[PDB]
Amino acid sequence: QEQMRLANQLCFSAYNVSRLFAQFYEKKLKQFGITYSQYLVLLTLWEENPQTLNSIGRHLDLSSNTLTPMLKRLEQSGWVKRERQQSDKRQLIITLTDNGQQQQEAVFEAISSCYDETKYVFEELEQTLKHLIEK
Amino acid sequence: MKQEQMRLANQLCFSAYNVSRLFAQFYEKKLKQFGITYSQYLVLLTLWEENPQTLNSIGRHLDLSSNTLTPMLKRLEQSGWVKRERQQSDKRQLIITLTDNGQQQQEAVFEAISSCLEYDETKYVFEELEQTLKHLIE
DNA sequence: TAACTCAATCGCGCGCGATTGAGT
DNA sequence: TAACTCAATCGCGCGCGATTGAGT
């Protein structure tokens, strides 16, 4: 029973924390016209560009069920280019525009202008949950 | 130097983003058989501690509001877990009450979750970050 | 021909900023 | 008439189990 009461106040605690972060980021990002999930996508591109949809998904643990309609929105909003690979026409290559590439500094400033062992505790629970789900 | 602090905040959005997802995945897997979602399970946890309650009260406990809870208490009512009824005293208010079935099924649910499960130190680190972030938003 | 691997699509339930309109 | 406080509603963007259909 007590091991349940521990598990329950961890779903709940992690459930609050990700919501509050998401709130905090969307507050600052509102002015650029992008969401936090789009921001995450843009963080992966800012590190490695171009990338395939599949590659971005692997970085974020997401798939095309999320990333297909969401890269579209980033394209419509001028941050990225979606185009088919000639080499393999099933694949989809996501490339930053110049405007997408350029605004990184502006975005990072907006966020920045508004805990050493914590990160370890998350990264470990992340791992513990990943084995509990799979197999 | 500011850039290093950003990288830290980015790999915490992301790390808590992954952890919340995985827990939801885990609790949906186990709760599938009872025909409830994890968010409904959360609502049910507060009723199991205190019943009845108003929609507003539940929302205070989970930091949610009617925009989420209104359509979601309707699903739990349709599924037989709760009653939704107007307060005679104050007809703006909406009182949530567990059914017998919703009350009685607690043990069954907990068992289903329990049987698939030092980590107390961890709970303190989350609770604190929660509290840092709450003040950061206001 | 088939097996395989992709993004795209479908259905649903959140979360949440914002607004509405009933009720006190 | 007003101020105030509720659940309900609206619109949108996720997340994700599941399926589809184009391409290799």
DSSP letters for B30-54: HHGGGT--HHHHHHHHHHHHS-SEE
Method: X-ray
Which DSSP helix (H) or strand (E) runs through B96?
strand B94-98
Which phi and psi (to 5°) does residue B22 adopt? -55, -40
Chain B: residue nearest A10 by CA? B123
Query: What count of Cα atoms within 13 Å lies in the side-chain half-sphere of residue B30?
Result: 19
Could you say which DSSP state residue A80 is in? E
Question: What sign does the CA torsion over B25, B30, B34, B40 have?
Answer: negative
Q: Which two tokens stand for residue A80?
A: 């990225």
Give the Cα-Cα-Cα angle A36, A40, A41 (nearest 5 degrees): 120
CA-wise closest residue to A105 among A46, A19, A18, A56: A46
Verify if strand D has an atom below 7 Å from the CB of A89: yes
Q: Residue type at B73?
A: L
CA-wise closest residue to A81 among A72, A90, A91: A72
Please indicate whether, in this complex, the C-beta atoms of B137 and A15 are within 8 angstroms of each other: no
Verify if strand D has an atom below 7 Å from the CB of B100: no
b (16+ CB within 10 A) / e for B79-102: eebbeeeeeeeeeeebbbebeeeb
Length of chain A counted residue by residue? 135
The nucleotide whose C1' lies nearest the CA of B92 is D6
- Distance (Å) from the C-alpha of residue B99 to the closest C-alpha of chain A? 22
Distances (CA, A) of A39 to A9, A16, B20, B52: 29, 20, 18, 41
What is the rounded CA–CA span in Å between residue A9 and residue A11?
Answer: 6
Cβ(A25)–Cβ(A36) under 8 Å? yes
Map residue A115 onto helix, strand or coil.
coil
Q: Residue type at A64?
A: S
What is the rounded CA–CA span in Å between residue A91 and residue A89?
Answer: 5
Give the Cα-Cα-Cα angle B69, A9, B121 (nearest 5 degrees): 155
Chain B: residue nearest A134 by CA? B26
CA-wise closest residue to B123 among A96, A20, A13, A107: A13
Backbone torsion region of residue A96, taken as left when φ is above 0, otherwise alpha when ψ lies between -120 and 50, otherwise beta: beta
* Chain B residues touching residue A23 (CB < 8 angstroms): 137
CA of B102 to C1' of D10 (A): 31
Distances (CA, A) of B96 to A8, A112, B53, B69: 22, 43, 5, 11
Q: Which two tokens stand for residue A127?
A: 């791992």
Q: Which domains does chain B have, with CATH numbers?
A: 1-138 (1.10.10.10)
Cβ(B55)–Cβ(B69) under 8 Å? yes
Give the Cα-Cα-Cα angle B22, A56, A12 (nearest 5 degrees): 20
Give the Cα-Cα-Cα angle A123, A127, A131 (nearest 5 degrees): 170
Strand C bases with any atom < 7 A from protein Cβ: 5-11, 13-18, 21-24
What is the rounded CA–CA span in Å between residue B40 and residue B101?
Answer: 15
> Which of B5, B25, B114 is opposite residue A133, by nearest beta carbon?
B25
Distances (CA, A) of A119 to A7, A65, A76, A114: 19, 29, 35, 20
The β-bridge relationship of strands B82-86 and B94-98 is antiparallel
* The residue to which tokens 């999320």 are assigned: A66
What is the rounded CA–CA span in Å between residue B115 and residue B117?
Answer: 6
Please indicate whether, in this complex, the C-beta atoms of A111 and B17 are within 8 angstroms of each other: no
What's the reported resolution, in angstroms, to a tenth? Answer: 3.0
Task: Identify the bridge partners of residue A82 per DSSP, sorted by sequence position.
Answer: A94
Backbone torsion region of residue A87, taken as left when φ is above 0, otherwise alpha when ψ lies between -120 and 50, otherwise beta: alpha
Q: How many other C-beta atoms are found inside a 10 Å radius of the C-beta of residue A117? A: 7
